[PDB]
């Protein structure tokens, strides 16, 4: 499925992910797309921080969902 | 009515509130339920931040609505 991640600067990145893919997989996709480290990226969905062990289906992430990406120092 | 508040840890808290109840009453209920002070608690719902001088009906908060709770340091 297609998902969208918005950064704090308004930049939007579109990625292809599956419901069974974990947040670690989304972090790896973001690292491939932009170069931000997986440990330096924090994912927020519906006002709750996404867990790396939990998957997109566990967080009820559907197609064309919007997530928030935070860059960590 | 019944409302749901989700934190960053994934825990969902169910609260009994009314449309005329202000966000200060919701903060007092959250302080009674979890112990988090109202001064460090921020409520996010429907793309806007909850104001202490506003009510749930002003924010168009209906039954079984989901809000996001942020705990300040």
């Amino acid at each position: 499925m297609q998902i969208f991640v918005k950064t704090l600067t308004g930049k939007t990145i579109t990625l292809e992910v599956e419901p069974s893919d974990t947040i670690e997989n989304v972090k790896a996709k973001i690292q491939d797309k932009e170069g931000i480290p997986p440990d330096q990226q924090r994912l927020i969905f519906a006002g709750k921080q996404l867990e790396d062990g939990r998957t997109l289906s566990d967080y009820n992430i559907q197609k064309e969902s919007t997530l928030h990406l935070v860059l960590r120092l | 009515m019944q409302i749901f508040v989700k934190t960053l840890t994934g825990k969902t808290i169910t609260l009994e509130v009314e449309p005329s109840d202000t966000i200060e009453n919701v903060k007092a209920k959250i302080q009674d339920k979890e112990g988090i002070p109202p001064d460090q608690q921020r409520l996010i719902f429907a793309g806007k931040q909850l104001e202490d001088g506003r009510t749930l009906s002003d924010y168009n908060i209906q039954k079984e609505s989901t809000l996001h709770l942020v705990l300040r340091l």
């Binding site: 704090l8 927020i44 969905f45 919007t66 928030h68 935070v70 120092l73 | 996010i44 942020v70 300040r72």
Partner: peptide, 29 residues
């Protein structure tokens, strides 16, 4: 919204990292 919550959390984490930098300072000199 998710964006304003993300910005607030980013600003708070930047404050935490600035406190960490101040602690590193107190270690150094």
């Amino acid at each position: 919204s998710d964006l304003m919550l993300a910005q607030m959390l980013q600003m708070e984490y930047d404050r935490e990292y600035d406190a960490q930098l101040r602690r590193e300072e107190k270690k150094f000199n």
